Design a protein around this nucleic acid. Structure first.
Lengths: 91, 98
DNA sequence: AAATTTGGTCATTTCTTAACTAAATTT
DNA sequence: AAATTTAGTTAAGAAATGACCAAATTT
């Protein structure tokens, strides 16, 4: 049912799959703890940068550098994909 | 002075290591693993939406966790997320968060 | 009873897009 | 040498934005 997931180990050394979203939650839950109450700023543009980069990396690995195929595979116009690569200096 | 915290470490999930020692790793890495695993299952099946797919998995939690923080306050949420109040509303409607 | 937030339109921008190139590159 | 990819242009369609406001609410 659930396609984007990550392996997790438990007390009894049983590896078991968990939805990526569950990690994203934890990641923040922690981030908020760290902050006492220091107003947050561009949390979106932060999380994006944190997700886009792994994603771009992987499809530009799975398509072995093929931007034309990479774009197709993600559903975004090639030119957009170029903009993002440029945006993290992945070109 | 203050020690450096690289953007990688600003958002982190905890993991057990080789020596059964708990430690934070960047969120990036969870995202990598999730795709590395997602491809492995794919086996030549073709993909088209992978961005939206990823985005939807990530946005839900963010909206979710921010709205708990601001205790339902949209004006606050959208401000600390750094987006328009109107789009935050749009996204929230999209993910059935009402 | 003030102050804030919600919800909702509206105009301007800014971003994404397909549709086309000619060049470089893979096949 | 033909087919595919790249690195661009364009235009035009879509998404995001701040600025409003009137109502609902929270202080």
């Amino acid at each position: 049912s659930d396609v984007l997931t990550v392996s997790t180990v438990n007390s009894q050394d049983q590896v078991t799959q968990k939805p990526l979203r569950d990690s994203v939650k934890q990641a923040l839950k922690n981030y908020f703890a760290q902050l006492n109450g220091q107003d947050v700023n561009d949390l979106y543009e932060l999380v994006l940068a944190e997700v886009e980069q792994p994603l771009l990396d992987m499809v530009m690995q799975y398509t072995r550098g093929n931007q034309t195929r990479a774009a197709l595979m993600m559903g975004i116009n090639r030119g957009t994909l170029r903009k993002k690569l440029k945006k993290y200096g992945m070109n």
